[PDB]
Every structure is written in C-alpha cells, then in structure tokens.
Design a protein around this ligand. Sequence first.
Ligand SMILES: [Zn+2]
Ligand SMILES: [Zn+2]
Ligand SMILES: [Zn+2]
Ligand SMILES: [Zn+2]
Ligand SMILES: [Zn+2]
Ligand SMILES: [Zn+2]
Ligand SMILES: [Zn+2]
Ligand SMILES: [Zn+2]
Lengths: 157, 157
Amino acid sequence: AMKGDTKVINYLNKLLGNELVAINQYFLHARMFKNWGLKRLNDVEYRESIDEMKHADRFIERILFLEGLPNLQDLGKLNIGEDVEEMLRSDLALELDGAKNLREAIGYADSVRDYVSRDMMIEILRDEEGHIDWLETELDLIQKMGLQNYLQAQIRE
Amino acid sequence: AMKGDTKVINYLNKLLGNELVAINQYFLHARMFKNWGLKRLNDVEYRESIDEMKHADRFIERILFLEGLPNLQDLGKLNIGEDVEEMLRSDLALELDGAKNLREAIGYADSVRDYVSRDMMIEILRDEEGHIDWLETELDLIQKMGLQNYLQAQIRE
Ligand SMILES: [Zn+2]
Ligand SMILES: [Zn+2]
Ligand SMILES: [Zn+2]
Ligand SMILES: [Zn+2]
Ligand SMILES: [Zn+2]
Ligand SMILES: [Zn+2]
Ligand SMILES: [Zn+2]
Ligand SMILES: [Zn+2]
C-alpha cells in the first residue's frame, strides 16, 4: 500500500519483460536438448527456467505493491540458435544484457532510496551471475574441445 | 524421423509463437487477478495457461519430428490491459487471431496430406474455441451488469 517512483516501476517492467523472454527461450531450448538426448543440458535449463519464473513473480508482485501495473515493452525476436553452441551463446547474450539492465536499475533504485526494490534486484542479480558463469563455462569447454567432441562427451555410459 | 512440408513447419512456428504470447499474458493476468482477490478469474486463467503450455509442447514436438527447428517470429507488444474488462478483451483478441491462424494452418496441412499435423491442430483448435466461449461469456456479463457490479459479484460470501 504505497505509490512508487515512476522510473523505478518502468525499470521493473523492463526487467520483467527480460525474464519472460528468457523463460520462452528456455521453453524451446529444453525441448530441443531433450530431443537430442542431452539430459545434463536439459536439466540445467529446466532448473534455471524455475529461477526466472521466480524472478518474474517478484517483479510483478513489486510493481503491484508500488501501485503500478504490469506493462511490457516489445519483447522482440528470439534468436533461438540452430546448434548447441549457438543456443548457449544466445542465452549468454540475453543474460549479459539482463544483468546490465539489473545493475542500472539497482543504481537508480539505490539513488532514490527505494531500498526494498534495490534489495530484491540485488538478490535476482546474484542468481543471474550464476547463470552467466554456467554459460561461460560451457562455452569455454565447447571452444576447447570442439563442438562435436563436446557433444559426444555429454552421452551417458 | 521424416522431413515435413516447409510451409507446414512455418505455420507450426507461427502457432507456437502465438501460444508463448498467450502464456506470457496469462502469467501477468493471473497475478493481477490474485492481487485483486479475484479467485474465480485467477483459477480459469491458471487452468487455461496449462492448456496453452500443452499446445506449445505439441507444436515443438511436431516441428522436431518434421526435422524442423523452432524459430519464432517477432512476438510483438502485449496489450495487458488496465482493468478487468480490458484484460479479458485483450485475451479475446489474441484468442480469435490464434483461432484464425489455426484454421488457416489446418486447411493447408489438410490440402498437402499432412494429416498428422492437421489432426493435432484440430485438437488444439477445439481447446481454443473453449477459451473463446469463456471470454465471450464473461465479457457479455460485464456489458450486462456494468463492470463494477460484475466485479462486486465475484466477491466471496
Ligand atoms: Zn537456453
Ligand atoms: Zn531472472
Ligand atoms: Zn538468468
Ligand atoms: Zn565457436
Ligand atoms: Zn488473461
Ligand atoms: Zn493454445
Ligand atoms: Zn487459448
Ligand atoms: Zn465495455
């Protein structure tokens, strides 16, 4: 029961849209992984999709508490990718942009004393840095091994 | 293990994108309803969101079976709406466009003897006509009652 900063609400709406794009992209990648028998990749995607759903729910709850309404930007075109490397590299692109947006939002909410919105986003950003670390690590392994050797290494004994 | 019609795959990708837009919009509406204490509205949304997730999964599975890959169009801007009538009227707009697209796809898959894709979409279209009926009925009740009386009538004894 309070009216929040108008720029804070706009940030929260931008960030919510980011989470929804990521969840859509996870929906497609999971099924693609599963079809190729890539169970370890599928299980990480699935698990991170749960993280993002939790973030979106937090955003919407915060917007509603601030007497704002959910109102999304153009969510654009997804770049789903055609092979595993491209899929993970697209995910990394989304994640790095989302983290950039989160930092910007955090700086601004902090600057205007919206410390509840700030603290929620800080928690979310910690989750996203974990997502980034995972992607970077996998992509570095694909570069080291070559994609086909990497994929062959996912096959279960 | 077969290669499907290229236009059939493009239809399936278009229709999949439709389902993802609808699921995003359900995610936002559910939480908005829940916040306003509109439990009956929230429960229908939630339940239909489950239908749409099932449809998207069918589409992706069919695309993968046809040796296609998931590849989405611009999913655009959602019109979330600012009051209950606007929210339901936006849902009706999505649903009517999605049903139009499904009929078009059904006619074409039938015309090229892709009767498995045709039959899957027919099943999906039956679900969507149910969604439409529900929306139209609620919207007719809002017109009859006025929105405020309608909303007051949702309140639980
Ligand atoms: Zn992914
Ligand atoms: Zn997230
Ligand atoms: Zn993430
Ligand atoms: Zn490379
Ligand atoms: Zn809705
Ligand atoms: Zn559907
Ligand atoms: Zn529907
Ligand atoms: Zn009206």
